[PDB]
RNA sequence: UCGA
DNA sequence: GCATCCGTGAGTCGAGGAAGCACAATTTAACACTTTTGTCAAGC
DNA sequence: GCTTGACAAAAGTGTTAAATTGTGCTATACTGGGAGCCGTCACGGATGC
């Protein structure tokens, strides 16, 4: 049974960002134009995002620092 | 004068049986707590912590 | 068939009730709290009130 | 495609003779009515082949609030309109033409339908430009463009912009959970309160005693002015048929029933009652 | 569901349950004229 | 400890009541009433006393014209 | 077009199943297009030709 | 997520 | 006829924190103009 | 105590310039979704095998 660290969670959910974005871009290179494209044509970055900023609100891992003293803190 | 001889319901949750509910007079008392009679404790299993 | 309704397996007491197009009388003391009527005992009896 | 030409055409001459009668011989009259026959049964076999090209376009367009049988169903309608439209003498392939109305018809439909409050075709246009507007302007700058950068890209006022924007808010389930649910929280806003109720009752019985002392005459100009007891509130006109005067001599009796109001002894009761 | 995979309340949801309209809106009820605060020792109070 | 009496005590007579059912709300965020439950309903019924538990059902929540007119007497 | 009030049909045990003798599994093919069935035959006519 |  | 599997239930109050255009149809505003109303002054 | 006429404001009111709104259409060829689900526990009774 092992612990899964702050810097792992956040890995885990730009994972599922890159992912959610490679459906884009693998749908964009096939239809968009040809040959002059580039990633400047078809890259939207929303979804990566969107996954780092759903992931910080919202989830039961993120939460608000409880602070009444240093010690709780 | 309002006060006079006007009872209340004091309830203590969670209520198990009847007696969790009981009447009294009451006596207005300075601060923002609330003074119990130390017998009724029994029935409310009411813990002053 | 509202005092099952109010108690467990709402959705199995209701469709069995309207299949048999069932009538409940508003005896029990749950009905009379749910419609907001004087429960039939303590002081709500027939006699006392 | 000819299968399907040849039978509206055939049930359309049919038509003609209809209110024209001239019945047709009866193995030309049976010939006809078959083409009609062949010509439906072209036309949904049509239809049933090129099903999945309409599946295969409206995969993309799912988790924009749309289910995604709503969307193949939606595809289908463009695919009727589509046959119905479609030319063969171009010699190009169905799924060419095809491809532009199951398209048209999939994004015609969300526009129409996805949203709770639904917004007009026209509204949704300038809603997705302002998006792309503002994605490639985060692309360009590295930072969120603000209302006057997308105002200027847009060829709009930058007060414009925000109120576009602001349309484009979304409701929010009243069920949501975050264990009460949030409708708990809203408090109805027309709901009676008791204090200003009773309030108003105490101020009706303090305007009678007030009104009661004056001029019965008085009274009523005030009554009717007002509308009071009726409701609705009157003209100097309309007061001057029952009291058979002028709407000037009201207008006389109107202010100085009023100073007469005014002076301290009727008005030093009525001071809390500004609001 | 709706946004989030947050399924949908429907008809029956709003009877069924603890948040139903039985044991909750009905078999129970919030009231006026009512309130709450700690408690403390009333030594020098009478039983009633 | 951060439990104290000034944040927890509470009272209420007439407040803001909910849009679907007419009875008062929770938290004193709100300003709202104190619940009065299924088991503090067996409590009400074992003394056997009818008219303040229907009181306490009616007038004191949900019926609309009551509750003013109680707030009038 | 009629629609199955799913209630009656999906709760258990099935009224619509018990009512007209049909199977559960087979009513759910019967009402979601999955299958057909048979709604009248004429055995008469059948019998003669 | 905590208090009895 | 039997057993595997779906359906229902498992404490009470609190407190708190997140594509694009064209074109026809239509309703909305915008304006010129007349009636209806509140008004000031003078005299009957 | 009331009325007059002239008088300005307001209130409509009908008519026109305008914005808003709804529907149709786009012709290389393109044709069967992807999402996911692990940690009850006890029980009853249908349903399914």
Known sequence: ?73 | EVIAEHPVLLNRAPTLHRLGIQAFEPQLVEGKAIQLHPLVCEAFNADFD | ?49 | AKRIEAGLYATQKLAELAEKGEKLPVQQRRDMQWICRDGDRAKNHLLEANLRLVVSLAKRYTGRGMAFLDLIQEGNLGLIRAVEKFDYTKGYKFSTYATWWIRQAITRAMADQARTIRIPVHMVEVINKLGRIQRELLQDLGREPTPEELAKEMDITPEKVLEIQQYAREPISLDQTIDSQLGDFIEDSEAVVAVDAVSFTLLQDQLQSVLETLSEREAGVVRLRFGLTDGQPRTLDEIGQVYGVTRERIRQIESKTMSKLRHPSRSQVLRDYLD | TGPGNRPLKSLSDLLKGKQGRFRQNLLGKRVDYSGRSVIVVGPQLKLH | LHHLVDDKIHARSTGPYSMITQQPLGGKAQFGGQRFGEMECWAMQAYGAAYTLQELLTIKSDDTVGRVKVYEA | ?49
């Open chain 3, 1 to 49: 068939w509202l005092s099952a309704a109010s108690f467990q397996e709402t959705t199995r007491v209701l469709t069995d009730a309207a299949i048999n197009c069932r009538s409940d009388k508003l005896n029990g003391l749950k009905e009379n709290v749910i419609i907001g009527k004087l429960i039939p005992a303590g002081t709500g009896i027939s006699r006392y009130r």
């Open chain 1, 1 to 73: 049974r092992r612990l899964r660290t702050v810097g792992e969670l956040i890995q885990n959910q730009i994972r599922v960002g890159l992912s959610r974005m490679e459906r884009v871009v693998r749908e964009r290179m096939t239809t968009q134009d040809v040959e002059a494209i580039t990633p400047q044509t078809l890259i939207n970055i929303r979804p990566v995002v969107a996954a780092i900023k759903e992931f910080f609100g919202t989830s039961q891992l993120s939460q608000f620092m409880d602070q009444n003293n240093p010690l709780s803190g």
């Open chain 7, 1 to 49: 077009a009629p629609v199955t009030h799913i209630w009656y049909f999906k709760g258990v045990p099935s009224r619509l199943g018990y009512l007209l003798d049909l199977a559960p599994k087979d009513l759910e093919k019967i009402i979601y297009f999955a299958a057909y069935v048979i709604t009248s035959v004429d055995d008469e006519m059948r019998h003669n030709e």
